[PDB]
Amino acid sequence: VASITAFKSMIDETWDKKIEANTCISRKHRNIIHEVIRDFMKAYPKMDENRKSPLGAPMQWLTQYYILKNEYHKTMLAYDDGSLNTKFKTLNIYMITNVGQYILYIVFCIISGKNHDGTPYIYDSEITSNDKNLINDRIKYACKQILHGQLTMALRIRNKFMFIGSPMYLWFNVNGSHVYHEIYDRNVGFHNKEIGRLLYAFMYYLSISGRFLNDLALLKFTYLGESWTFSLSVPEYILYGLGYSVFDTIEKFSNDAILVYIRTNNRNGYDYAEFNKKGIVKVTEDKPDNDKRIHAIRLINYSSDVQHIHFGFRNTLIIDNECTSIQSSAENATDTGHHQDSKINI
């Protein structure tokens, strides 16, 4: 209910802010969106045994049979006389010119299990279908359609840092490399440095690091049966888009030291907890407010190549609050300001 209230407040406050050049979504609004997605996942975690997917696909968050049974979706659609639902019906891909419209459209399409065209992600008659190609194509098409639509809006309104990442359940057996080489093969404009940089950073990282890395994994997440293995440093945008939080279950497979950023402090810095032992790590610290919650993990090791070592820098591992100071490209990346940071597990 608190997440829905925060969502309403964000939509009401950002309904007139026009999407312009060098605009970005604030940390508070990103945390609100993240909490909405997490509560939508948590409302119906598992699936009923009567209608179960033999492939292990998360049908409980993609099928209309489970969306309409989800109580969080019903409460979101009937919070205040369907005011959010009424505004949603007058929004499409080629008409959005405001930040609140962008957020409402993307989040409501995610939580209702519908694409931007209007079709559901996976139909109710294909829950128990054993055809792997059909379900895989549907999931990949849903994720690619979300990312494409965001990049199309980025090209049309000439914005640079608008980013609502596809959640973790829309990456079931979906190759990140294929997504990058299918979205950026056409629309060469997408390659411009002034159009869609955060989406480019999100897709490039998932094209070089797969969901499962077998024995090369140095870190693993787990949230309601969805897992993801990381070998490099995990920036804030990756965890924000995928939907994982630093307060979830984290499994260390190596003795390399990690820096789990949890929250911001009053000295314009970030507070982190350091772990350098094998085991299951779950941060005991209290969850901060939506304006002070940061999800980023940095691997302090030298085994990673210099080709992708720029992801571990402080100014790019955590998205800057100022829109013009957001660093996403490898060339524009700095590691400064560790004096402002602090340690919480002393």
Partner: antibody, heavy 121, light 106 residues
């Protein structure tokens, strides 16, 4: 030295309730998970759940669901476990086990002293 | 629940021998296995975490190995203070199920 002093042995009756305390010293009570593992006489170890002292959240086992209420009082660094509807098979040495490292929900070290809760008529 | 089964339930040995304890899991539990040591009348003591890492204070004679559903605890040279009951502990899936126990006797 990390110490976990527990309460004395309690001779309860069937259908009653037992509250086993666990006082911690030598380490920061918040930040380390407190687990509760019992050992029946002549049997192995059974896991009951963990309690996070900093937040207050808990995760009980399905076998001990609806009967265990793990509370904490951070003013005395004391951990409390309450077990209701004591049957005859609940007689065991209830240990409180701190996590082996800071916010590590993997292994238990140390294990305290133990409380011989004898449920008999 | 992932049941843990320990094969050598009673392993007689002498001072200066090599003892092997095997703990097989019903389902894959990754590298998340913890070995304990419980002398009679005392609380259990952790000796090896993550199935290959020795805890601080544990003598170097203990050495663990294994992955998936096969694990092994090895004592290079047995000592008179190593005669106790040893337990496994998986942590991949809740609840954390222990083992039956293996006891060393002279």
């Amino acid at each position: 030295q990390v110490q976990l002093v527990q309460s004395g042995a309690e001779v309860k009756k069937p259908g009653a309730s037992v509250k086993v305390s666990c006082k911690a010293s030598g380490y920061t009570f918040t930040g380390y998970y407190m687990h509760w593992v019992r050992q029946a006489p002549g049997q192995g170890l059974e896991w009951m759940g963990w309690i996070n002292p900093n937040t207050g959240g808990t995760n009980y086992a399905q076998k001990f669901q609806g009967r265990v209420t793990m509370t904490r009082d951070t003013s005395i660094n004391t951990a409390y476990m309450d077990l209701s509807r004591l049957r005859s098979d609940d007689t065991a040495v209830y240990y409180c086990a701190r996590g082996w490292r800071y916010s590590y929900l993997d292994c238990f070290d140390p294990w305290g002293q133990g409380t011989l809760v004898i449920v008999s008529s | 629940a992932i049941q843990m089964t320990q094969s050598p339930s009673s392993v007689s040995a002498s001072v200066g021998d090599r003892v092997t304890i095997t703990c097989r899991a019903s389902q894959g539990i990754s590298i998340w296995l913890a070995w304990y040591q419980q002398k009679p009348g005392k609380a259990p003591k952790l000796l090896i975490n993550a199935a290959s890492s020795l805890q601080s204070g544990v003598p170097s004679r203990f050495s663990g190995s294994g992955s998936g559903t096969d694990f092994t605890l090895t004592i290079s040279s047995l000592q008179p203070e190593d005669f106790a009951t040893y337990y496994c502990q998986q942590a991949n899936s809740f609840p954390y199920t222990f083992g039956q126990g293996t006891k060393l006797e002279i």
